[PDB]
């Protein structure tokens, strides 16, 4: 059994999002499929689910009136629709199907969620795609230095150092969401002071949605 | 609605130790339909126990579940490196399924004060009309830390943000980055930029600062 979900999506406040989940393996029709979300840094919240053969949905009271879960047995695909979106609906949405006992995947259902999709990040925002500026955090036995990747949208951004050759002492921090609705993150590394003469330090920043790919040399 | 309470929300333990995690339900969980999941940063949760005490094949037998009614326990007989993660309980003994808020099991180590570094705005950024000043609190333990920005000794509010890394897999420390942001014009109205740090490993607050 594998669940594959649709890709990340940016949605405007007040819009509706649809996220899909394609199952392959075992039986689609007679096993319970649920949706569970997780806001950034927060816990898992069960939203609801569907048993496709019976078309019996079951929604958390908190989402009853905003949510529709459907199942298309011809494609083994399940859908979550969530309406009237607000910033607090920003989260990773996972589909999950109940496990089964014993060998194979056609055994007796266990209710609990054994099989999870990879998750779909839905970001609710009015911001428009924007690439970051990349600014050095110049170094002053141990020195610190880094890069400030400021004002980008949407997530994600990745950062490596010296094309992946420098990992020791590297800390790349979670992004923070600024009042502008744009993100900023920082990446730093600590090194021996004496290497500042002998060695080059370059932060490789990649923001695919804006095609910002900057390799910023950071020096004293 | 069944409220599940996982308390404490964090446990600091050493590799090889035993861990017992509590899940208390506000009402009796129907037919002991209580599951436990593990989640590591950046990953989907993974089912460990279902029906209070049943373990899927594939799941390490050092995880066991027990309890019934309102009082449930996940036991990890001996913690391996990969067991340091977040654990959630879930009840599905009623149509309204609920999760606990999770318990993070993290690596206990000796107290380590942050090394603190302050970074003035880059000349590049200053050209653009904005000034961000960054404070780094590096490799500290435990996670609890505070930074306060002062500008000419005036305490700042509403113009900074911070984040914290995940516990380092090698040295079990945390680091924190804070950015103070001002317009260039406002930045140029002041001289001293200071970040003041408080942490259990410091007998009194540490200040790093520069003079614009």
């Amino acid at each position: 059994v594998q669940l594959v979900q649709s890709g990340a999506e940016v949605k405007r406040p007040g819009s509706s999002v649809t996220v899909s989940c394609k199952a392959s393996g075992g039986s689609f029709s007679t096993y319970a499929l649920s949706w569970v979300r997780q806001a950034p840094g927060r816990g898992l919240e069960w939203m609801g689910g569907v048993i496709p053969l019976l078309t019996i949905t079951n929604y958390a009271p908190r989402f009853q009136g905003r949510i529709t879960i459907t199942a298309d047995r011809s494609t083994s695909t399940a859908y979550l629709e969530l309406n009237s979106l607000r910033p607090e609906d920003t989260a990773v949405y996972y589909c999950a199907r109940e496990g089964t006992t014993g060998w194979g995947w056609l055994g007796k259902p266990i209710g609990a969620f054994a099989h999870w999709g990879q998750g779909t990040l839905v970001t609710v925002s009015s911001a428009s795609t924007k690439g970051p500026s990349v600014f050095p955090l110049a170094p002053s036995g141990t020195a610190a230095l880094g890069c400030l990747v400021k004002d980008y949208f949407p997530e994600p951004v990745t950062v490596s150092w010296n094309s992946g050759a420098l990992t020791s002492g590297v800390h790349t921090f979670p992004a923070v969401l600024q009042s502008s609705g744009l993100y900023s993150l920082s990446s730093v590394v600590t090194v021996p002071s004496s290497s500042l003469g002998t060695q080059t330090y370059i932060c490789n920043v990649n923001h695919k949605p804006s095609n910002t790919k900057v390799d910023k040399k950071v020096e004293p | 609605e069944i409220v599940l309470t996982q308390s404490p929300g964090t446990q600091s333990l050493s590799p090889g130790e035993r861990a017992t995690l509590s899940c208390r339900a506000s009402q009796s969980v129907g037919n002991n339909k209580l599951a436990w999941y593990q989640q590591r940063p950046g990953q989907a949760p993974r089912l460990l126990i279902y029906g209070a005490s049943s373990r899927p094949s594939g799941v390490a037998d050092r995880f066991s579940g027990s309890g019934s009614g309102t009082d449930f326990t996940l036991t990890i007989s001996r913690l391996e490196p990969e067991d340091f993660a977040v654990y959630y309980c879930q009840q599905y003994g009623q149509s309204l399924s609920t999760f606990g808020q999770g318990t993070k099991v993290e690596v206990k180590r000796t107290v380590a004060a942050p090394s603190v570094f302050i970074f003035p705005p880059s000349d590049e950024q200053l050209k653009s009309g904005t000034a961000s000043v960054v404070c780094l609190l590096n490799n500290f333990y435990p996670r609890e830390a505070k930074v306060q920005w002062k500008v000419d000794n005036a305490l700042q509010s509403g113009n900074s943000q911070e984040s914290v890394t995940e516990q380092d897999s090698k040295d079990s420390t945390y680091s924190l980055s804070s950015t103070l942001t001002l317009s260039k014009a406002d930045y140029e109205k002041h001289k001293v930029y200071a970040c003041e740090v408080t942490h259990q490993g410091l007998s009194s607050p540490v200040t790093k600062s520069f003079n614009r």
Partner: peptide
Amino acid sequence: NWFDITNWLWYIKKK
């Protein structure tokens, strides 16, 4: 309990 439905389903479809 909606979470028990599929189990009944599984049982009645064996026979």
